Amino acid sequence: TCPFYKKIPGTGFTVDAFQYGVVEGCTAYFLTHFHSDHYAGLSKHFTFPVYCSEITGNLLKNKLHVQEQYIHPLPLDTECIVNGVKVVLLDANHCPGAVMILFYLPNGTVILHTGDFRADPSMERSLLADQKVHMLYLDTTYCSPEYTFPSQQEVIRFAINTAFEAVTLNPHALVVCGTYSIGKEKVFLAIADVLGSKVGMSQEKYKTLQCLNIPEINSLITTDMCSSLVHLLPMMQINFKGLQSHLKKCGGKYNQILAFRPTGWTHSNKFTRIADVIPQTKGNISIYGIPYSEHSSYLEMKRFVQWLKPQKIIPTVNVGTWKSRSTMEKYFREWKLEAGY
Ligand code: NI
DSSP: OOOGGGEETTTTEEESOOSSSSOTTOOEEEOOOSOHHHHTTOOTTOOSOEEEEHHHHHHHHHHSOOOGGGEEEEOTTOOEEETTEEEEEEEOSSSTTOEEEEEEOTTSOEEEEOOSOOOOGGGGGSGGGGSOOSEEEEOOTTOSTTOOOOOHHHHHHHHHHHHHHHHHHOTTEEEEEEESSSOOHHHHHHHHHHHTOOEEOOHHHHHHHHTTTOTTOTTTEESOGGGOSEEEEEGGGOSHHHHHHHHHHTTTSOSEEEEEEEOSOOTHHHHOOGGGOOOEEETTEEEEEEOOOSSOOHHHHHHHHHHHOOSEEEEOSSOSSHHHHHHHHHHHHHHHHHHTO
16 A cells, blocks of 8 residues: 655655556656656556656657646746645656655645755755745655665766777777666766767667667667667677677677666775776676666765754655664664754
């Protein structure tokens, strides 16, 4: 049954709650972003109102075939009225089309649901600064102090320099980048840009990217693999067997693969600096794991919450074990005591 942390009190609303069947007394289903754990259960047969960003609405219509009459896209940073309740969508700095939702309840409570986010100081100057928030439903994916990682900018710098060096030394090398959902587009796009190539990909992936309103996308992506030296593959295929196989398919156009797997976190971060990262190599294949995250680090999350000073925090991630839940609640108390709220 629908967990409490997907329900907005004082409304008929749910958030990312599409896998429970008909939620009893839900008059509007919000979807924060197009990732499978959050959209699971949507299809062409869904007949209730879905509220989302324009980009998420493009993906609903074109990838899952949800009918147009049930998609209610809302513009960002704009006061809107839904079943008599004022709401605002804000940029979550997650994947394309991902939002946070501000709800202004009739009784005067103000709730922020972050959906999935990577906290950023830029948020401290949006519509959030203009009023107080009583309840925060928080993306706690990496809510433990061992989760440190570099800025997205330092990681893209490392990838571009690595790729440019490799292909300049060997103009017959192929670069491969893994993907399994929308998000992290900058990795493969920035590499293609420095090399003067388009990114080659499957028809289904090309379709997904064309839903995202990315400026100048017809210039950066293609389905013609033959004309490209940056290929996008499913993440699962980013291993020595999958890559040896792919290289065979290219028919002696290329004699080396440099591949990138942008993971969330990996334990090498506690010990290693981005400058200090090395690939796994076998034969003429090298694989780099790079810590490109689209979730808050522990310190980025902590800053955001200590700025916002909510009266109550409701975690939405890692809530399934008692030891996790208990540890998170202890961090929230430290933060409140340190900041004085
Ligand atoms: Ni997500």
